């Protein structure tokens, strides 16, 4: 439940976020996933808006990310972020805000521990 | 609002917390506030349950905390933690879970930033 509540704060911040700021998130999460897969050709999935951004700014993405090839995949219901997989679909990395918040849960718990026990 | 939602997680954890674990929180927050005030005689305020614990385990508190004198003050509506002030009331330190969560907000924001931008 704490994961859900923190994601509501994320969704509040996304409510006024400019496209340029959101794109910085897109590039960072894309790059991280692509580095991990260590492949030049990948398929990306996210919500409609995000895939539209990636398509619109592919030049900017290739400049900052190096020599990688991206193919849009199916749209998925997500608040943001990206799911990146090898072209053959064998390996998939989930970098959606929902999955990332779950993985960062430990950090929220460290904060709570500090509040309680210092 | 994010502060309120994280405090709901704190309140969930307090729902099953044993007296001994809660007392570790009490001692830690009391000690921190007393060190800051750097005074031997202080007055403490918290909810009824907490003041009752402090009263019941004053020996344990004095052993782990050194030579300090504590006087119970008025009960305040709080989830837990303590408010400690000099006997003359001139200086007061707010170490209630509510105040501490507010002060740790920045930590929750660092986590959110990581989720969004890595």
Curated annotation (Swiss-Prot), chains A, B:
GO molecular function, one term: proton-transporting ATP synthase activity, rotational mechanism
Keyword Membrane assigned: yes
Residues of the full protein shown: 81 to 198 of 198
Gene source species: Pyrococcus horikoshii (strain ATCC 700860 / DSM 12428 / JCM 9974 / NBRC 100139 / OT-3)
Main localization of the protein described in the UniProt heading: membrane
Name of protein: A-type ATP synthase subunit E
Compartmental location: Cell membrane
GO cellular component entries: plasma membrane; proton-transporting two-sector ATPase complex, catalytic domain
UniProt record, GO biological process: proton motive force-driven plasma membrane ATP synthesis
